[PDB]
């Protein structure tokens, strides 16, 4: 392909709360810190909560009422 017009396609890291770290090339540049992936995803599971996927459980145990 051409040069100097195509965006930069470095390989960055997709490290999700899923805990999976994948090396994709993209136009991101920085190390990417995620929340959900092809794994730890609802549709890719049947578990409610497919991963902590957000610690608002903390506030929910900050107010404890159950």
């Amino acid at each position: 392909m051409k040069k100097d017009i195509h965006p930069k396609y470095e390989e960055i890291t997709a490290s999700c709360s899923c805990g999976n770290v994948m090396k994709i090339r993209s136009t991101v540049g920085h190390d990417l810190n995620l929340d959900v992936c092809s794994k730890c995803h609802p549709f890719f599971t049947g578990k409610q909560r497919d991963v902590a996927t957000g610690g608002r459980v903390d506030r929910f145990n900050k107010r404890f009422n159950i």
Partner: protein, 82 residues
């Protein structure tokens, strides 16, 4: 705000209806009225049709959609401009 010593507020019908759903489906909402009930992190992933005075406006429960009231997401007056 609500007193901590007092806790959260949520209708029992809402909780139990919510429970039967987390028992027995994921695919459809509930048609509620309790704009004053709170959103439990356990209701996440649902898209309940909450009343607003005349209409059951639906609200998809997400992580951040936890610490407010059902009435917070069913506006009541329709302003457009003058």
């Amino acid at each position: 705000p609500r007193s901590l010593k007092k806790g959260p507020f949520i209708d029992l019908h809402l909780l139990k209806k919510v429970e039967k759903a987390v028992e027995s489906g994921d695919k459809k909402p509930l048609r509620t009225w309790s704009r004053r009930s709170t959103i439990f992190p356990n209701m996440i992933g649902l898209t309940i049709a909450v009343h607003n005075g005349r209409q059951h406006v639906p609200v998809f429960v997400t992580d951040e959609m936890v610490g407010h009231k059902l009435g917070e997401f069913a506006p009541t007056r329709t302003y457009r401009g003058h």
